[PDB]
Amino acid sequence: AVKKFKPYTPSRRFMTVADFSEITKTEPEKSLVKPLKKTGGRNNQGRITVRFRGGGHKRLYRIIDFKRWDKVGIPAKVAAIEYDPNRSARIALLHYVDGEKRYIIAPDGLQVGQQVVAGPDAPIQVGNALPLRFIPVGTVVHAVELEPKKGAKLARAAGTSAQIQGREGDYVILRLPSGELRKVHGECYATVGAVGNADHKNIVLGKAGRSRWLGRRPHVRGAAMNPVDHPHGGGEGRAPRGRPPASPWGWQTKGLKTRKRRKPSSRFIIARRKK
Amino acid sequence: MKRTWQPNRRKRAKTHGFRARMRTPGGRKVLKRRRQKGRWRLTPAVRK
RNA sequence: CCGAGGGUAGGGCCCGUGACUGGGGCGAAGUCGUAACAAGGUAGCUGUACCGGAAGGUGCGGCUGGAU
RNA sequence: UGGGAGAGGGUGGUGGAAUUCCCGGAGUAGCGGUGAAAUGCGCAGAUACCGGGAGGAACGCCGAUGGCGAAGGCAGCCACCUGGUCCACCCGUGACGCUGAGGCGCGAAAGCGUGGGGAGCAAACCGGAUUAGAUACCCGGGUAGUCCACGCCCUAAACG
RNA sequence: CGAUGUCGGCUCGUCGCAUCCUGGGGCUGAAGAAGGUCCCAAGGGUUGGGCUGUUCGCCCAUUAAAGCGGCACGCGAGCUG
RNA sequence: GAAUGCCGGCAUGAGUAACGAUAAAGAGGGUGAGAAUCCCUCUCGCCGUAAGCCCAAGGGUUCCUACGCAAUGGUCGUCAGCGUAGGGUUAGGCGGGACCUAAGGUGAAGCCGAAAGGCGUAGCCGAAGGGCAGCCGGUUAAUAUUCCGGCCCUUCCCGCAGGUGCGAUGGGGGGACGCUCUAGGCUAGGGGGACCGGAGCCAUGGACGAGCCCGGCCAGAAGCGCAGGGUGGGAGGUAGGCAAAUCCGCCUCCCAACAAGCUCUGCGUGGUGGGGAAGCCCGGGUGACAACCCCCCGAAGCCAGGGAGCCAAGAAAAGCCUCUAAGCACAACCUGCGGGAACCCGUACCGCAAACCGACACAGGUGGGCGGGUGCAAGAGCACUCAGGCGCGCGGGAGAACCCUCGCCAAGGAACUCUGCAAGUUGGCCCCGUAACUUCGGGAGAAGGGGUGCUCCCUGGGGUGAUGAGCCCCGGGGAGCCGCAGUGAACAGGCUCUGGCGACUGUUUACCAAAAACACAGCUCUCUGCGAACUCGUAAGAGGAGGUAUAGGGAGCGACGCUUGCCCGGUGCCGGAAGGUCAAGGGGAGGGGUGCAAGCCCCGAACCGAAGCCCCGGUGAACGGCGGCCGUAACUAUAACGGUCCUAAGGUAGCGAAAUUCCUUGUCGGGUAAGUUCCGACCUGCACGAAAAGCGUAACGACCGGAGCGCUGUCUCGGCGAGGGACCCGGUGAAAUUGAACUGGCCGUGAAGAUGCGGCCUACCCGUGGCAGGACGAAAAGACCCCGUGGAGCUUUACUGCAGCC
RNA sequence: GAGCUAGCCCUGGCCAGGGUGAAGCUGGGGUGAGACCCAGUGGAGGCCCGAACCGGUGGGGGAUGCAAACCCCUCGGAUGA
Numbered sequence A: 001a002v003k004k005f006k007p008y009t010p011s012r013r014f015m016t017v018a019d020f021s022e023i024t025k026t027e028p029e030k031s032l033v034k035p036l037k038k039t040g041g042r043n044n045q046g047r048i049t050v051r052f053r054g055g056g057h058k059r060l061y062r063i064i065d066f067k068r069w070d071k072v073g074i075p076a077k078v079a080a081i082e083y084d085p086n087r088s089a090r091i092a093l094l095h096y097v098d099g100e101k102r103y104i105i106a107p108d109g110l111q112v113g114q115q116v117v118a119g120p121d122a123p124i125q126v127g128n129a130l131p132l133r134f135i136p137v138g139t140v141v142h143a144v145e146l147e148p149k150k151g152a153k154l155a156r157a158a159g160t161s162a163q164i165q166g167r168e169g170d171y172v173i174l175r176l177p178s179g180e181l182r183k184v185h186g187e188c189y190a191t192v193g194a195v196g197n198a199d200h201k202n203i204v205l206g207k208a209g210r211s212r213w214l215g216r217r218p219h220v221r222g223a224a225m226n227p228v229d230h231p232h233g234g235g236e237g238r239a240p241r242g243r244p245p246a247s248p249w250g251w252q253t254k255g256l257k258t259r260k261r262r263k264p265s266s267r268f269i270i271a272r273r274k275k
Numbered sequence B: 001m002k003r004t005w006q007p008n009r010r011k012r013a014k015t016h017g018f019r020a021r022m023r024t025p026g027g028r029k030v031l032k033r034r035r036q037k038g039r040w041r042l043t044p045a046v047r048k
Numbered sequence C: 001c002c003g004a005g006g007g008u009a010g011g012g013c014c015c016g017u018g019a020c021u022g023g024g025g026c027g028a029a030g031u032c033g034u035a036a037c038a039a040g041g042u043a044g045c046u047g048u049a050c051c052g053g054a055a056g057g058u059g060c061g062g063c064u065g066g067a068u
Numbered sequence D: 001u002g003g004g005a006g007a008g009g010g011u012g013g014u015g016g017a018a019u020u021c022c023c024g025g026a027g028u029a030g031c032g033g034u035g036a037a038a039u040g041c042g043c044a045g046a047u048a049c050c051g052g053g054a055g056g057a058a059c060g061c062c063g064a065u066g067g068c069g070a071a072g073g074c075a076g077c078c079a080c081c082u083g084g085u086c087c088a089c090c091c092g093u094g095a096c097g098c099u100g101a102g103g104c105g106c107g108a109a110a111g112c113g114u115g116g117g118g119a120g121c122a123a124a125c126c127g128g129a130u131u132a133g134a135u136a137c138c139c140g141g142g143u144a145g146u147c148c149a150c151g152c153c154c155u156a157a158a159c160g
Numbered sequence E: 001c002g003a004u005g006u007c008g009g010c011u012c013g014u015c016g017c018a019u020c021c022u023g024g025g026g027c028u029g030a031a032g033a034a035g036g037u038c039c040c041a042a043g044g045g046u047u048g049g050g051c052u053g054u055u056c057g058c059c060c061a062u063u064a065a066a067g068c069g070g071c072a073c074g075c076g077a078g079c080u081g
Numbered sequence F: 001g002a003a004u005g006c007c008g009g010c011a012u013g014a015g016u017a018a019c020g021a022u023a024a025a026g027a028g029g030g031u032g033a034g035a036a037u038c039c040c041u042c043u044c045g046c047c048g049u050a051a052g053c054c055c056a057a058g059g060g061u062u063c064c065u066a067c068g069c070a071a072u073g074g075u076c077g078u079c080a081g082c083g084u085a086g087g088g089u090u091a092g093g094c095g096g097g098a099c100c101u102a103a104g105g106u107g108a109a110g111c112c113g114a115a116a117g118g119c120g121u122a123g124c125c126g127a128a129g130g131g132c133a134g135c136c137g138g139u140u141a142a143u144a145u146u147c148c149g150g151c152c153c154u155u156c157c158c159g160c161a162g163g164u165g166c167g168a169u170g171g172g173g174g175g176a177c178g179c180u181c182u183a184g185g186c187u188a189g190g191g192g193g194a195c196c197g198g199a200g201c202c203a204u205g206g207a208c209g210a211g212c213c214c215g216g217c218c219a220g221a222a223g224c225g226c227a228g229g230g231u232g233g234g235a236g237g238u239a240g241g242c243a244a245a246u247c248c249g250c251c252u253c254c255c256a257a258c259a260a261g262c263u264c265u266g267c268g269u270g271g272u273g274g275g276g277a278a279g280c281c282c283g284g285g286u287g288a289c290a291a292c293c294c295c296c297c298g299a300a301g302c303c304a305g306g307g308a309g310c311c312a313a314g315a316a317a318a319g320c321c322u323c324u325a326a327g328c329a330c331a332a333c334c335u336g337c338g339g340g341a342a343c344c345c346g347u348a349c350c351g352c353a354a355a356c357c358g359a360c361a362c363a364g365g366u367g368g369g370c371g372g373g374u375g376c377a378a379g380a381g382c383a384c385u386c387a388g389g390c391g392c393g394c395g396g397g398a399g400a401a402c403c404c405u406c407g408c409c410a411a412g413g414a415a416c417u418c419u420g421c422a423a424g425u426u427g428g429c430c431c432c433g434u435a436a437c438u439u440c441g442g443g444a445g446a447a448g449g450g451g452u453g454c455u456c457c458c459u460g461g462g463g464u465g466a467u468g469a470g471c472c473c474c475g476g477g478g479a480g481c482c483g484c485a486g487u488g489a490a491c492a493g494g495c496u497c498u499g500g501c502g503a504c505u506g507u508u509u510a511c512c513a514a515a516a517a518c519a520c521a522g523c524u525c526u527c528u529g530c531g532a533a534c535u536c537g538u539a540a541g542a543g544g545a546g547g548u549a550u551a552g553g554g555a556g557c558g559a560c561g562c563u564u565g566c567c568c569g570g571u572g573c574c575g576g577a578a579g580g581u582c583a584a585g586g587g588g589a590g591g592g593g594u595g596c597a598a599g600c601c602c603c604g605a606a607c608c609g610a611a612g613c614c615c616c617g618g619u620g621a622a623c624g625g626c627g628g629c630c631g632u633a634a635c636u637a638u639a640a641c642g643g644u645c646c647u648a649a650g651g652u653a654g655c656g657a658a659a660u661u662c663c664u665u666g667u668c669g670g671g672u673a674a675g676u677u678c679c680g681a682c683c684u685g686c687a688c689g690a691a692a693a694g695c696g697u698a699a700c701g702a703c704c705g706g707a708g709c710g711c712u713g714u715c716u717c718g719g720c721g722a723g724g725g726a727c728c729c730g731g732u733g734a735a736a737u738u739g740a741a742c743u744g745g746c747c748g749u750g751a752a753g754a755u756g757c758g759g760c761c762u763a764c765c766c767g768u769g770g771c772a773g774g775a776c777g778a779a780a781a782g783a784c785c786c787c788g789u790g791g792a793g794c795u796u797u798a799c800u801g802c803a804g805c806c
Numbered sequence G: 001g002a003g004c005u006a007g008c009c010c011u012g013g014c015c016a017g018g019g020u021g022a023a024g025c026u027g028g029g030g031u032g033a034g035a036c037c038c039a040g041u042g043g044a045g046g047c048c049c050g051a052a053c054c055g056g057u058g059g060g061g062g063a064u065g066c067a068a069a070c071c072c073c074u075c076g077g078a079u080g081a
């Protein structure tokens, strides 16, 4: 439920902030946080390899449990729902009856005080995690492993989910957040429900400095540069593209497909994405 | 106005020091050349 | 002290007028088409939307004040 | 107090028919369309037929000259929440009534905002016909929209 | 071309006369007044403003008149820009 | 003898410019061969959120003392950051190391690369971050939290006592954290005192006073007090914290809970140890048995790991505590106490500057802390002042032009000019009051006005204290006084109307452009299913991201509002298992060479044979593009209408002489006495037009345009005055430039603009202050222009390669 | 060679004083319940004014400079990109 501001500054006109109404705890679990090495887009050579990065707020990384088949059959209680600055989803704190404490991505609907459980036997309930094969067809699911025991890979951002469409041998057919239809192996785990905080996409950053807080440095158009810099650079006055619109490195950037031709996973993609 | 030389003993020893030169093929050629030329100092002085 | 009024500054309402511009009314015999009245030759009207020299047309939903 | 009928409203489920698209099979010289055609589609294998799948929308028969609502309006089926209303008994209150400038709420369609959805249909638009013309009627396409949520708009041959 | 700074303005002048005014004339289709045209004449004079970077030009208000040209389209080791 | 030659020397310019902030000097005494310049005294001025004081860098003896003055010092010099010599820097507690980790760096394992080398988990290094024990005073010419004095403390070793399951690089707890706002209580610091201490003072008309002037504290162990921080206790279960665990985590039960207790800091007090002014007298002595007290103000510092709110969600590791494992429980560890032990490096001095970075004793640059008082609403602003530190290392005169910086100006008031450029005006606070428009915030300090000192009287509330007095803080009313004038000095908006552009705050060409440019939230297209795409790299490996389509890359557009039309023929991209073409390879009809021959060797057609291209489609917020001629209405004119050619389609809405309009100062209207600019219209748009977005838009802008009011030395049109220079004298003393010079005007001549040639004219020799017409003056081997089969950046459907991708 | 300058990473530090007065909260009003209104409290913001600090808009000076970019007056930001 995005929060608005009155227009008492030029920027407060349009700025919207998340309501934080599901958050029940506001400092993280000390045993589950570790320092997040900020990069600024620089690789091990020190070269910028992803432009316009750096300068964002400091962050601690919350270790997230993307396996859950770690602890089959062991119920846990949802102790808290917490803000995670490293991802769009919120995160839920789990207290296992083990005494072990872990973080999961917080699905929509999940409540503090309810219990979740992982395993082939687990009830089909929001927050439980089962192998894909034991989830009934038609079930909305998130935090999906792409390959068995390799870790949850798909549908992790706020509001996203995959839907189960059917089974075909050892595999299930998922409709991913992108609308692609893909065969994912049935022993891959998934968590029942959609990821929460679906209002994330309606946040209006509102001002330039808000992008700066997030580590996003200003992005400068090719058309603003010189020919030394960019295909779209130069010209007297403004200039249209004057050639097929291109990236700084010369490749076409309006339509040109880029998935590797002979990639082995093509056997498992049924239909490319939609809209 | 702020000029270009802003001395700093740690910066000097770590950039041009003896150990910086020995760590690298190019740096060792520097020491080799300055020895062959007979330089009284192979490396800049800094008071550490 | 108050004080006719004069001065300075800023408001409100009304009247007249203005390059140009909007449509309206009227005007014996102009130009274009033929929308409506017969099922008016696509039943008509309608609120709305979009479009078209023009009347109009078309979409959606409504009315019979529609014929057979 | 005790009963009844009902597409009255809201929510969430869920059932089959049909259209479209995808896949597999089978099969070949046309299909479609009209007043007649053409555009379109089809040997790069269409149409027609069979099995599988996805998805949206609308609910055939019952169905009526029917029923419900204050009106706008409401139609598969199920459950829940809820309004109105009628009848019987003649039990309670004791005129506590009628209307109602303002106010408030409701208000078909189209339209608007933000998300979502999108099968069919279809303003705009394109093409094919027709015609003196044809910014139409007819044909092949087709974007909004038609659908859902929330928020607006507040119109009507909102009529008996 | 081992550089002769380029438009306009400002400042400062000085010169020519094919004279705008003022002085002297002849002719007039010169009654007077006022003009026209030509001759002599360079002593002095030849305004303020609106517009534009402007030179120029148009306009306002005047004036005896609001001259036209040369001086590296006078003048940036004088200024402006 | 020339090369703007090279090296050196020495001239010219010239006793010229200058002598480095306009904070400022004068006199007496002394020293000395010599004194504006050194020392001392008195007087004057300057800084005082510094121009004072303390750290950190960097510098490296510059520190102190004696003896010196050749050079260095912009003059002088007896002086000096200079020369010579001697002296000077003292630590278990300050800083760093024998402690910890951060980025990063390095790197057993391992990975990769022709070589060189590149990576890389642990580990190691790495600090201004974490951690850790010293405060006050005295002393030296020069060091001091270092020496000394007083009072405190830390670790290591060993011993004694008491206690305990002791024991770790392993487990756990803790360390451990943001931004804004902020409570209570304190401290630093400060103000006042009619109280306490003090050498003295009475002046010049008055004052012997509840007079003036000076000072009225600092550190301190335990204990105690005040204020805070941290922290539940017990039991039972237990499968998690990669072994174990009595610890931690999770479950349950009992009790405690805005407490308390325990613990830990801060402040206060505290044995004790110190300090102690003016003034006077020669840094010292005295004052002095110095006194050392009360009230008020009060932090941004402390208690602190405090509290609240918010979103952008805020290091690590060790010290420390707890758990246990090998082990070992004659040990070991814990607590107390005692004795012993306690290393290396730095320490001088400068440090907003004459000692650092700028070639200079250079008006520039340099991070942290302290930074007193009064008044002005506040404040680190401003004026003046304390402590402290300076008068800026050439002076003395004069009182021209001219220049700079500054003050004023009769009448006028933008007439100045490209332009109100510049300079006026306005200016703080309190109160009254405030428009279109608007996105309801704003526009707004709109505009425009009134008030402002001092005195007396009456009075309201708050803080401290006690509820009072005193002190302190916000006020209210009445009556008066003075001046030209009361934010009386200093610091402190001119305003309005209307266009263009850009939404806005931001960013930029270091050193000629700050803007309309870039960025920006927002909108759209597009790629990307994760070992993602993309990027850097030969690779390994990284980034992307410990992210996962509500995400990430690329591209354009640029808040917001209302919108974004038609063309897919060409180019691009997307789809298309057919067909055409298509390399290596397959195939081998059929030939050829050689050999006696078996053979060996060579050429080789059909046909099979990828991507790409052809071909069929799609696609515009992909590259792009969006017509011509002729005719027509009952006045004329003009054409709603028509004809025909052409195209892939012929520009829609909106806007338009525009940041675009050539003709052009279009035409008309407004504004002006007058308007090439401006605003409003018209539309024959040379040559607008819809995300290289179209049209608007409140608010914003050191943007660019037009107007008005206010006010002015901008101007008519200049005048006077101030200081710093210019000028003169003493000291010191450059520069570019320079073929040599005994270097005049005119009219001619000349390579076409002559001091230098001809003919005239004019002219005694040599300077000083000035002005800039000439020496085609200086400066820079023209940056425009061309030329060179000269170079370099950039582009592309130029050529040819290469990476990359297929 | 990044001791200048550009960006990023780690760790510290700094931003006098004054002004405006968002959300929320409380109370009150309102209603069937609401929305909502008013008052108080509150202290938000690439908010406002203005030092330090960071800039460099206009003009003047300087131009063999104090200075190979300085000086004076004026001006922009100053809790934030």
Ligand SMILES: CC(C)C[C@@H]1CCO[C@@H]2[C@H](CN[C@@H]2C(=O)N[C@H]2[C@H]3O[C@H](SC[C@H](F)C/C=C\[C@H]2C)[C@H](O)[C@@H](O)[C@H]3O)C1
Pocket (backbone or CB within 6 Å): E003, E005, E006
């Ligand atoms: C239509 C025009 C283009 C014709 C043109 C005009 C240019 O100038 C002349 C040329 C002929 N030669 C002339 C020439 O070269 N002037 C140069 C001058 O540069 C500076 S003046 C600072 C100026 F800002 C630069 C202006 C001029 C530079 C080039 C020197 O101090 C001067 O001595 C002098 O050298 C003719």
Ligand SMILES: [Mg+2]
Pocket (backbone or CB within 6 Å): A003, A004, A005, A006, A012, A013, A014, A015, A016
């Ligand atoms: Mg908002």
Ligand SMILES: [Mg+2]
Pocket (backbone or CB within 6 Å): A006, A007
């Ligand atoms: Mg609002």
Ligand SMILES: [Mg+2]
Pocket (backbone or CB within 6 Å): A019, A020, A021, A022, A023, A090, A197
């Ligand atoms: Mg939430």
Ligand SMILES: [Mg+2]
Pocket (backbone or CB within 6 Å): A030, A031
């Ligand atoms: Mg940790």
Ligand SMILES: [Mg+2]
Pocket (backbone or CB within 6 Å): A037, A038, A039
């Ligand atoms: Mg990283």
Ligand SMILES: [Mg+2]
Pocket (backbone or CB within 6 Å): A044
């Ligand atoms: Mg590395």
Ligand SMILES: [Mg+2]
Pocket (backbone or CB within 6 Å): A049, A050, A051, F535
């Ligand atoms: Mg990149």
Ligand SMILES: [Mg+2]
Pocket (backbone or CB within 6 Å): A040, A041, A042, A048, A049, A050, A051, A052, A053, A054
């Ligand atoms: Mg980057």
Ligand SMILES: [Mg+2]
Pocket (backbone or CB within 6 Å): A086, A087, A088, F547, F551
């Ligand atoms: Mg994310």
Ligand SMILES: [Mg+2]
Pocket (backbone or CB within 6 Å): A082, A083, A084, A085, A087, A088, A089, A090, A091
């Ligand atoms: Mg989150």
Ligand SMILES: [Mg+2]
Pocket (backbone or CB within 6 Å): A146, A147, A148, A183, A184, A185, A188
């Ligand atoms: Mg799989």
Ligand SMILES: [Mg+2]
Pocket (backbone or CB within 6 Å): A201, A202, A203
């Ligand atoms: Mg968004």
Ligand SMILES: [Mg+2]
Pocket (backbone or CB within 6 Å): A056, A057, A058, A213, A214, A215, F312
């Ligand atoms: Mg961030």
Ligand SMILES: [Mg+2]
Pocket (backbone or CB within 6 Å): A211, A216, A219
């Ligand atoms: Mg971004």
Ligand SMILES: [Mg+2]
Pocket (backbone or CB within 6 Å): A219, A220, A221
């Ligand atoms: Mg950009």
